[model samples]
Target: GSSGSSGSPEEAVKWGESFDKLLSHRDGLEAFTRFLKTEFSEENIEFWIACEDFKKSKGPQQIHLKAKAIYEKFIQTDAPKEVNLDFHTKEVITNSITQPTLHSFDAAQSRVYQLMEQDSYTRFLKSDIYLDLMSGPSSG
Candidate 1:
């Protein structure tokens, strides 16, 4: 049987330090995402995660398709999961969209990350989900 042991208290401490430190670790990213879901504001992280995955694309075809997918889903006006981005940021992304570089979403991602850093991320450290992880019998 597997213990699913990696979601440990020791690991949670590292995540509490900073948003970058939290997201740089895979488990911490997921932990933070779960917190975002309860608040019904997971779009930013979802968008950021998509951008992270988009960078792993190996070919122009992939970059083009995934880039458009991201735009349609989160960047374009009236998109279903549209994230909070300034008009200029959207304008820059739209202007460069024809070329579809891997960095197309960088600005949007950074802005969203900044929003979380100043808001939800601050609350996450004090949340019961995180604090419980640090104290329960399952702590590691």
Candidate 2:
């Protein structure tokens, strides 16, 4: 979405206008989902990893509260409001980090259980406890 104006303010305005049109009717979650699916696909894991690094560098509580604020705002806005919901924006940026925090912690705890099971020869572990643990292990 970043580009030069090419010395034509009118052209820049037109480009903004067109982009605005595409976002005019989209919901916040839908718009963000599309962005994640397209721009931040599996091939772009480094970007996500970099985001995680920055989140760690910033500290967790700060990032989690920030994410919660943004998530609450997205639920408030209808998305036709032309709000920016990306990394630079406040509303979605915190969420981007915090949601992943939730996921990673869930995963890490599950892994501890799994490694425990690797030594357990007695009982069966709950599948829910291992959700996505080995999913796409060959590739992801």
Candidate 3:
């Protein structure tokens, strides 16, 4: 999804154009219903999907605000139970270790090591269930 704009008037116009493109799909409901029926069985899953649908149904300005609110909630609270710490660790490693020769490992080997680290970190993160724990939680 195209990340929407916040302050600038030009970006706001761009966001509107992008949102119109999103809603321009034909048979959107049929497709959505099929996806929901096939992919999701849980009530929480259905409710989250419904929330997304409602967010998308709003105007661009409202959608942007809603997205911001969601992001704020995400940053403030712990991510979902299924969220993998390994994925984030791999992402950070991949982004940080771009130069293969300088890093002493080939790209593939580095990625494999990163994947292992990711798995380890994922377990650790699940145990603690907070970013602060990963960063060494403050002792009060």
Candidate 4:
């Protein structure tokens, strides 16, 4: 589901400059995914990615379907791949699902985004995976 390589060392360094930029790049997302998988919290990233795609849903039917899928997969208390979420955010998403909209998962997505930004992202910057990618010959 990721895109291309991490590009050159300069490009990698640029990505490391900001978490938003990093997530927008295919290579960075792939690297982050690898790191997240090792931490056994890949579901959080997956949910976040799904939300990004879900936001692009065109119509009510599409939004509704995607919302249901997201809720079942990552919002429900016993979801198979639930991402960690606060009670308020969970309640908000649960209520929003009944009348699905483009922004239905905004609160939940923001929570996950913040979680990764503050936690996994910081760790990722220091992880061997990132170091290797940055220093590898291909990166240059």
| Pairs of colliding residues, candidate 3 | none
Candidate 3 per-residue lDDT over residues 36-70, each given as its tens digit:
24433222122233334433444555544543433
Residue 94, candidate 4: how far off, in angstroms?
2.0
lDDT of each: 0.80, 0.32, 0.32, 0.82
> Candidate 2 at residue 71, lDDT?
40
Off by over 4 Å in 1: 1-4, 136-140
Better of 3 and 4 by lDDT: 4
lDDT of 3 at 82: 20
What digit string (tens of lDDT, one per residue) describes model 1 on residues 20-131? 9889988788878888788877877888888888889999998888888888888887887788888987877787777878676676888888888888799887776677
The TM-score measured for candidate 1 stands at: 0.86
lDDT of 2 at 127: 26
lDDT of 4 by residue, 12-77 (tens): 788877888889888888888899898888888999998999988887888888888888898876
Error of 1 at 26 (Å): 1.9
Error of 2 at 18 (Å): 8.2
TM-score of candidate 4 relative to the true fold = 0.86
Top lDDT prediction, candidate number: 4
TM-score of each: 0.86, 0.22, 0.21, 0.86
Across residues 29-104, which tens digit of lDDT does each residue of candidate 2 receive?
1332333344332112212222334345456676576445434433223422122223334334334544545444
lDDT of 3 at 17: 37
- Best of the two (1, 2) by TM-score: 1
lDDT of 4 at 120: 88
Residue 79 error, candidate 4, Å: 1.3
lDDT order, best first, reads 4, 1, 2, 3
Per-residue lDDT, model 1, residue 61, is 91
lDDT of 4 at 14: 85
